[PDB]
Amino acid sequence: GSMAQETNQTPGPMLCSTGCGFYGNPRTNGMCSVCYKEHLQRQQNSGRMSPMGTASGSNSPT
Ligand SMILES: [Zn+2]
């Protein structure tokens, strides 16, 4: 293996984290075009984002 001009595969396969089978982007949230929209919609609806096991503000009046 003297020469170094043998390209077989490209590095950095930013494949969709959700597993849809399409290419994703690292500038985005690691999701493709479709999944990035659905995911952000669910995150925006929350408002109180805090990944620490528990979360404050979970009341639901009848
Ligand atoms: Zn996707």
CSV table of C-alpha atoms and ligand atoms in Angstrom, one decimal:
chain,number,residue,atom,x,y,z
A,1,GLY,CA,0.0,0.0,0.0
A,2,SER,CA,2.4,2.7,-1.3
A,3,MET,CA,-0.1,5.0,-3.1
A,4,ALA,CA,-2.8,6.8,-1.1
A,5,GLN,CA,-5.2,7.7,-4.0
A,6,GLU,CA,-7.6,4.7,-3.3
A,7,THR,CA,-11.0,6.1,-2.4
A,8,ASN,CA,-13.7,3.5,-1.5
A,9,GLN,CA,-16.0,5.3,1.0
A,10,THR,CA,-16.5,8.8,2.2
A,11,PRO,CA,-16.2,9.7,6.0
A,12,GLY,CA,-18.7,11.8,8.0
A,13,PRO,CA,-22.0,9.8,7.1
A,14,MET,CA,-24.4,12.3,8.8
A,15,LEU,CA,-27.3,9.7,8.6
A,16,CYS,CA,-30.6,10.8,10.2
A,17,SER,CA,-30.6,10.1,13.9
A,18,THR,CA,-34.3,9.0,13.8
A,19,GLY,CA,-33.4,6.2,11.3
A,20,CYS,CA,-35.4,7.3,8.2
A,21,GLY,CA,-32.7,6.2,5.7
A,22,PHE,CA,-32.0,9.7,4.3
A,23,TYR,CA,-28.9,12.0,4.6
A,24,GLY,CA,-28.9,14.6,7.5
A,25,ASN,CA,-27.0,17.8,8.3
A,26,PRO,CA,-24.7,18.6,11.2
A,27,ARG,CA,-25.6,22.3,11.2
A,28,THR,CA,-29.2,21.2,11.9
A,29,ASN,CA,-30.1,19.1,14.9
A,30,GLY,CA,-28.6,16.0,13.2
A,31,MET,CA,-31.9,15.2,11.4
A,32,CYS,CA,-32.8,15.3,7.7
A,33,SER,CA,-35.4,17.8,6.2
A,34,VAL,CA,-38.6,15.9,7.1
A,35,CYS,CA,-37.6,14.6,10.6
A,36,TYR,CA,-36.1,18.0,11.5
A,37,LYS,CA,-39.6,19.6,11.1
A,38,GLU,CA,-41.5,17.0,13.1
A,39,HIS,CA,-38.9,16.9,15.9
A,40,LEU,CA,-38.7,20.7,16.3
A,41,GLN,CA,-42.6,20.8,16.4
A,42,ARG,CA,-42.7,18.5,19.5
A,43,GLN,CA,-39.8,20.4,21.2
A,44,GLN,CA,-41.3,23.8,20.6
A,45,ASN,CA,-44.7,22.6,22.1
A,46,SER,CA,-42.9,21.7,25.3
A,47,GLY,CA,-41.3,25.1,26.1
A,48,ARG,CA,-39.8,23.9,29.4
A,49,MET,CA,-36.8,22.0,28.0
A,50,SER,CA,-34.7,20.5,30.8
A,51,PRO,CA,-33.0,17.1,30.5
A,52,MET,CA,-32.1,16.3,34.1
A,53,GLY,CA,-34.3,13.3,34.9
A,54,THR,CA,-37.2,15.3,36.3
A,55,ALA,CA,-38.9,18.5,35.1
A,56,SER,CA,-40.8,21.2,36.9
A,57,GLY,CA,-44.2,22.4,35.8
A,58,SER,CA,-46.3,19.3,35.0
A,59,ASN,CA,-49.8,20.3,36.2
A,60,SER,CA,-53.0,19.5,34.3
A,61,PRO,CA,-56.3,21.1,35.5
A,62,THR,CA,-59.5,19.2,34.8
B,1,ZN,ZN,-34.9,11.8,8.8
